[PDB]
């Protein structure tokens with residue numbers, strides 16, 4: 013439509029808020045696959061940044077595939093490989109969630125302003141597999157990976 | 169269209185005709201799901217009247233929805249439950265037609281006038297599964313339900 | 326809210342699957358379940374005109390299917406059910422509704438009273 | 453072109469897609485069961501099924517066999533088939549929307565131009 017079309021001529025990125033994601037409890041309810049940016053170019057964010065990002069997404073993409081199989085044919089023809097993509101992806105998906113300081117007035121949970129450096133390191137490692145042993149709820153609503161570690165402590 | 173559109177509000181009862189219906193040879197080509205009356209009220213015509221009408225309309229709607237789909241996907245996958253309404257619906261679609269006395273030059277059929285109860289009952293029955301044996305065609309261009317039964321036989325070869 | 330909330334949710338869930346129904350020649354009972362809750366919850370949302378209800382009555386009825394009581398009932402009867410069910414509690418149980426009303430929610434108590442009220446009515450119903 | 457026309461097709465292809473999509477998940481299910489039940493048995497709209505036998509058509513220990521096989525092959529076939537059917541339906545829902553939206557826009561312009569045209573001739 014002319015209104016929207018015209019508008020995109022100027023936009024450098026989109027932040028797609030998703031009801032589907034929220035309903036899973038995930039917050040901020042941003043869509044990791046639909047939300048985009050012009051500057052997501054290695055030539056701009058640098059190879060590292062760029063690669064991690066491109067890592068987060070593919071994995072998130074792959075899991076989406078299996079999502080269909082899992083529910084129907086059951087979660088087990090899954091390979092030593094197909095089982096890791098998931099595990100991680102599921103750790104990832106969560107790590108992508110986060111506590112806001114604006115929502116402290118009664119979220120009980122303290123807010124986190126994760127730094128870019130910490131952001132790439134974080135996901136870097138999950139991809140890497142440093143915390144594959146770590147469990148899901150260790151990553152839900154935390155800041156830097158360090159908190160993913162400590163939450164696990166508090167969670168046996 | 170701004171005109172027809174603007175006129176609906178001036179009416180207490182509306183008979184909406186459709187070329188899609190007429191196109192099939194169903195005269196009078198009234199659209200059963202687009203025609204309304206302000207007295208279509210149980211408090212006014214009664215529930216037998218009412219329940220029938222509404223009954224007739226549900227099935228036609230139910231069938232409309234399926235039309236486009238079994239079209240492509242075919243009929244096998246349809247539940248007996250759902251393929252009986254395809255049946256009854258197609259039959260009703262017919263029982264709704266009627267030979268007018270002013271259109272013999274058109275239909276080549278003697279015009280029939282049907283009394284209110286003959287109408288209610290006839291449909292009531294179709295809806296009841298009481299004619300799932302007769303062929304649709306027996307239901308096309310006839311007056312009272314009995315002619316549909318008579319016509320079955322004549323059609324019986 | 327105490328009711329509206331789960332209803333809103335099973336319905337949305339039904340809506341996902343609805344189209345499948347009419348062709349459901351071999352459904353897992355997982356989804357086949359949501360199919361069922363769907364049609365009943367839907368039938369509960371029906372309503373005749375000129376007969377607006379009191380919030381308490383509404384929840385009482387919604388509770389009935391939402392809780393699962395009408396799941397084994399026939400879709401064709403929900404309309405009849407409700408009608409009579411509600412006629413019954415508006416008659417006999419004005420103290421429960423008065424509770425629900427006042428307490429503003431469904432007490433653990435009133436909750437249990439509804440259980441018996443509906444499980445005995447149902448029995449009545451499928452004579 | 454007719455927004456109503458397009459809305460019908462798009463209306464209906466949206467359904468068939470979801471139908472079609474559902475039928476595959478089923479087809480996969482049965483086919484899971486089947487691949488297992490198949491294992492032991494060898495040590496003893498359905499695709500091109502009915503036709504394949506049809507064309508080439510012109511001790512029971514074996515009846516269970518051709519059966520136990522003819523179901524894996526069938527539930528296999530339906531699966532894939534319904535898989536492409538929605539794949540087709542999707543390509544269509546995506547295609548029709550575009551026609552819709554082009555028409556949608558065009559209709560609006562067409563009218564406005566008519567109005568403006570008549571206003572300007574006074």
Ligand SMILES: CC[C@H]1O[C@]2(C)[C@H](OC(C)=O)[C@@]1(C)O[C@@H](/C=C/C=C/C=C/c1oc(=O)cc(OC)c1C)[C@@H]2O
Pocket residue numbers: 032033036037038044045072073075076079101105106148149152
């Ligand atoms: C449309 C949903 C998809 O969008 C995701 C990104 C995933 O898509 C792929 C590409 O990855 C997806 C399938 O699943 C969501 C996941 C939601 C997860 C919700 C987890 C909630 C949760 O998790 C916990 O571990 C503990 C919890 O409460 C105690 C709660 C509420 C994600 O955001």
